[PDB]
């Protein structure tokens, strides 16, 4: 509170570290469903059902243009990709499995890099 500050964690390397984690997600072989925005004109249901679409290339653009205020807003967008994937796919499908795989892969890199 006012004039009572918690010790300052070091956030100076966060942009580079998030960028690195994103590069690793972009090059994972199961990334293919998540590389580009879903085409809302062509894919049935998606525009109406998925209220906040998100994909790796949109995350890359936001990161490169200073649109993430901190590392937690970055993690929120990444998780949003996989939450959208669960909403729109059966676990027992290739895209459904890719989502579960990529989430596990991300959360491990996140823990290892920051926690
Ligand atoms: O063909 C599908 O199953 C599909 C298409 C677009 C997005 C998505 O999540 N799934």
From Swiss-Prot:
It is found in: Nucleus. Expressed at varying levels in several tissues, whereas a smaller transcript was expressed specifically in testis. Residues 9-113 form the Bromo domain. Component of the BRF-1 ISWI chromatin remodeling complex, at least composed of SMARCA1 and BAZ2B, which regulates the spacing of histone octamers on the DNA template to facilitate access to DNA. Within the BRF-1 ISWI chromatin remodeling complex interacts with SMARCA1; the interaction is direct. Component of the BRF-5 ISWI chromatin remodeling complex, at least composed of SMARCA5/SNF2H and BAZ2B, which regulates the spacing of histone octamers on the DNA template to facilitate access to DNA. Regulatory subunit of the ATP-dependent BRF-1 and BRF-5 ISWI chromatin remodeling complexes, which form ordered nucleosome arrays on chromatin and facilitate access to DNA during DNA-templated processes such as DNA replication, transcription, and repair. Both complexes regulate the spacing of nucleosomes along the chromatin and have the ability to slide mononucleosomes to the center of a DNA template. The BRF-1 ISWI chromatin remodeling complex has a lower ATP hydrolysis rate than the BRF-5 ISWI chromatin remodeling complex. Belongs to the WAL family. This is Bromodomain adjacent to zinc finger domain protein 2B. It comes from Homo sapiens (Human). The gene is BAZ2B.
């Amino acid at each position: 509170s006012m004039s009572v500050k918690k010790p300052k964690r070091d956030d100076s390397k966060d942009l580079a570290l998030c960028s690195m984690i994103l590069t690793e997600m972009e090059t994972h072989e199961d990334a293919w469903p998540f590389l580009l925005p879903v085409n809302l004109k062509l894919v049935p249901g998606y525009k109406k059902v998925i209220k906040k679409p998100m994909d790796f290339s949109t995350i890359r653009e936001k990161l490169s243009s200073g649109q993430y205020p901190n590392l937690e807003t970055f993690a929120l967008d990444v998780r949003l990709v996989f939450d959208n994937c669960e909403t729109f796919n059966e676990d027992d499908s290739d895209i459904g499995r890719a989502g579960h795989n990529m989430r596990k892969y991300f959360e491990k890199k996140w823990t290892d890099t920051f926690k």
